[PDB]
Amino acid sequence: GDDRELAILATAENLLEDRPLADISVDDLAKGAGISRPTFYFYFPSKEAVLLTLLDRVVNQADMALQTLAENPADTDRENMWRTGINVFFETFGSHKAVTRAGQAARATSVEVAELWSTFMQKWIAYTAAVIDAERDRGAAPRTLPAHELATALNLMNERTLFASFAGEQPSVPEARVLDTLVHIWVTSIYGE
Amino acid sequence: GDDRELAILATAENLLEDRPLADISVDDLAKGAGISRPTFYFYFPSKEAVLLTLLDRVVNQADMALQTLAENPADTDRENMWRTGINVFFETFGSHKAVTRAGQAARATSVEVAELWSTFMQKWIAYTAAVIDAERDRGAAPRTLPAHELATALNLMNERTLFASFAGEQPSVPEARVLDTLVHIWVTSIYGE
Ligand SMILES: N#Cc1ccc(N2CCC(CCC(=O)NCc3ccc(N4CCCCC4)cc3)CC2)cc1
Ligand SMILES: N#Cc1ccc(N2CCC(CCC(=O)NCc3ccc(N4CCCCC4)cc3)CC2)cc1
């Protein structure tokens, strides 16, 4: 039941490795899921709601992993705490690159994709700013920019850089170098005076 | 002659303040330019080639201003040299926000918009990396990350942050704060050890 639903999601994610949402039909999704076209429409109002759900699941998987990290701190130096947190996004979205690239293209046309994006970007920026403020209160980082504006620009940087890398856009940081590159920019901008 | 062409460009830019490319018709563009629809097609193969040209002009205006800056250095402290260079992008794209937002949405669907983007992003990253390498050779900045990977991530950050600000996306750095925010991240990541 939820079984046919998972099959429809697994098929869309496999086909999105191969072509854009525009070149995938509902019949392709039903064919791969082993169901009819009207049975598809029982589970999803459209192929776009299928993308929306896949993106929702990827975003919630990152959010949950971050929640886990936050509750039980990886005890390590400061550099490593930031590395570990950015790696959540690198590994989560990096394990679903076709969803990430399709979700990105859809932010342009879909009001629901734009809102899901915006809700989670705000949540992760607020968390990031809470960590920078924690570090400033303990005296580990200087009071330079407003924490919240710093956290917005660093999160936007990661979103754009991670996503260019995963799509291999011209130009982009190679995926094997993108984590070191981001952590250097984060640690220097947060701790630097 | 080039006169009717400018009129068609000026009309598209005015209408793009109001609605997306999808909600602008060739007849709207011809109506605003004071010409017929077939006379439009003489100058532009499509409304999309009109957007492509407007974006091309905005990108070339930024590039030329940067070329001017590069030939005659604004003599000032290091922080100010970076501020002045990023301000080229803030002022240029910031003076054509509807073109910038429409061009951005089109990168998703248009192969020619994607290539224009990619050509100039590479050129400005290469220039940025040349400046970081100049600073390292003179001993003013430490050899930390590869200059070119650092320059890719900082340019991607600016592209994403400037464009979110100009569109007032939720979330974004307020436009009155975005220049200070970026220059802090640049100067700390470039000079910080
Ligand atoms: N639709 C959609 C959608 C919504 C949001 C998206 N993204 C927004 C933000 C992007 C980058 C954010 C990002 O890279 N966040 C960095 C971050 C998060 C948490 C932490 N810590 C350190 C201490 C312990 C853990 C907490 C440190 C750094 C990743 C992609 C992307 C897509
Ligand atoms: N289509 C298209 C398209 C193509 C490229 C686009 N962008 C790409 C890069 C974005 C940000 C780049 C950006 O902000 N560049 C920063 C930069 C450039 C030059 C310098 N200097 C300092 C010393 C003297 C002058 C030279 C310093 C910083 C701005 C938007 C945007 C759209």
Contacts of A21 (CB under 8 A, 6+ apart): A47, A48, A51, A102, A105, A106
Which residues have any ligand 1 atom within 6 Å of their CB?
A 55, 59, 66, 69-70, 81-82, 85-86, 89, 103, 113, 116-117, 120-121, 124, 127-128, 131, 155, 158-159
Method: X-ray
- Give me the domains of chain A, ranges plus CATH numbers: 1-46 (1.10.10.60), 47-193 (1.10.357.10)
| Long-range contacts of the stretch B14-21 (C-beta < 8 A, 24+) | B16/B51, B16/B54, B16/B98, B16/B99, B16/B101, B16/B102, B17/B98, B20/B102, B20/B105, B21/B47, B21/B48, B21/B51, B21/B102, B21/B105, B21/B106
Report how far residue B90's alpha carbon sits from residue B88's, in angstroms, rounded to the nearest whole number. Answer: 6
Contacts of A71 (CB under 8 A, 6+ apart): none
Q: Say yes or no: B127 contacts chain A, CB-CB below 8 A.
A: no
To the nearest 10 degrees (0 to 180), the angle between helices A97-107 and A147-166 is 120
Q: Say yes or no: A34 contacts chain B, CB-CB below 8 A.
A: no
User: Residue A78 to residues A138, A150, B36: CA-CA distances in angstroms?
Assistant: 13, 17, 65
List the one residue out of A123, A100, A70 whose CA is nearest residue A175: A100
Report how far residue B128's alpha carbon sits from residue B151's, in angstroms, rounded to the nearest whole number. Answer: 6
Final resolution, Å? 2.0
Return the CA Rg of chain B: 19
